[PDB]
Amino acid sequence: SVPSQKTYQGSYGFRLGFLHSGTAKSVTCTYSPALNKLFCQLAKTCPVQLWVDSTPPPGTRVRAMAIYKQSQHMTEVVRRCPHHERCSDSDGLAPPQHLIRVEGNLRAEYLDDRNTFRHSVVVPHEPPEVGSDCTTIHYNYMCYSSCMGGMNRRPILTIITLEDSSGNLLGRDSFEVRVCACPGRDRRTEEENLRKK
């Protein structure tokens, strides 16, 4: 009833990486290592790097799923709010209820789990291109953390799982996400709150 969030590099040394985008007021996506928390604007590109020590087999996939971070909300499916699920902003592939989309990957598949009702988006894992040391998935988050009737100010985590062709676990990593109007200011504020604490 609750997806695991335990970090697990597995046999391939799987882990995420994030760009260093800074905290200017204009920044649209920024990652705080101190908080393990991505701050992003609504529906903007969030680059998430996938790092491995060795190449996983053909047919490996990479799944993203959101859960509520607070234990008392963890059994509730994270979904878009009653406004955004009805705003007809379909990309033609993502169901309108799904918070997390993958940008620019026609092989993305969106799952409504028939048992847990949780949403996820999964893409094939690809080896890095020539001259690159990792691959990158571009995610979009389609509601604000503050959306009433949806996340409703509750923090979420994104869990990224590396899976084999059957969906079995090969690796797992995760990060908190805040979807907000001013990620740069919010990252600065939360890092300051962490330093003061």
Closer residue to Zn ion in complex, CB, 94/170: 94
- What distance in Å separates the CA atoms of residue 115 and residue 34, rounded to the nearest whole number? 35
Both tokens of 22, joined, read 């800074």
Q: How far is the CB of 18 from Zn ion (least distance, A)?
A: 24
CA-nearest of 65, 54, 70 to 15 is: 54
Residue 14 or 141: the one with the smaller Cβ distance to Zn ion is: 141
> Does residue 151 interact with Zn ion by CB under 5 A?
no
101 in contact with Zn ion (CB under 5 A): no
Q: How many residues bind Zn ion (CB under 5 A)?
A: 5
Q: What x-and-dash track marks residues 5-44 binding Zn ion by CB under 5 A?
A: ----------------------------------------
Q: Which is nearer to Zn ion, 46 or 50 (CB)?
A: 46
Select the residue interacting with Zn ion from 29, 143, 159, 162 (CB under 5 A): 143
The correct pick among 84, 98, 125, 188 for binding Zn ion (CB under 5 A) is: 84
Q: Would you give the distance in Å from CA 87 to the centre of its chain?
A: 21
List the beta bridge partners of residue 172: 8, 161
81: contact with Zn ion by CB under 5 A? yes
Are 27 and 166 spatial neighbours (Cβ–Cβ below 8 Å)? no
**147 touches Zn ion by CB under 5 A:** yes
């391939």: which residue's tokens? 12
Residue 147 or 160: the one with the smaller Cβ distance to Zn ion is 147
* Alpha-carbon distances of 62 from 49, 105, 193, rounded to whole Å: 11, 12, 33
**Binding piece for Zn ion, criterion CB under 5 A, among 9-17, 68-76, 142-150, 185-193:** 142-150
The answer on whether 81 is annotated among ligand-binding residues is yes
In order of 101, 121, 172, the CA distances from 48 in angstroms are: 13, 14, 13
Strand partners, 179: 40
Q: Which of 142, 159, 134, 147 is nearest to 69 (CA)?
A: 159
Going by the annotation, the residues of the binding site for Zn(2+) are: 81, 84, 143, 147
User: Which residues of the shown chain bind Zn ion in the complex (CB under 5 A)?
Assistant: 81, 84, 143, 147, 150
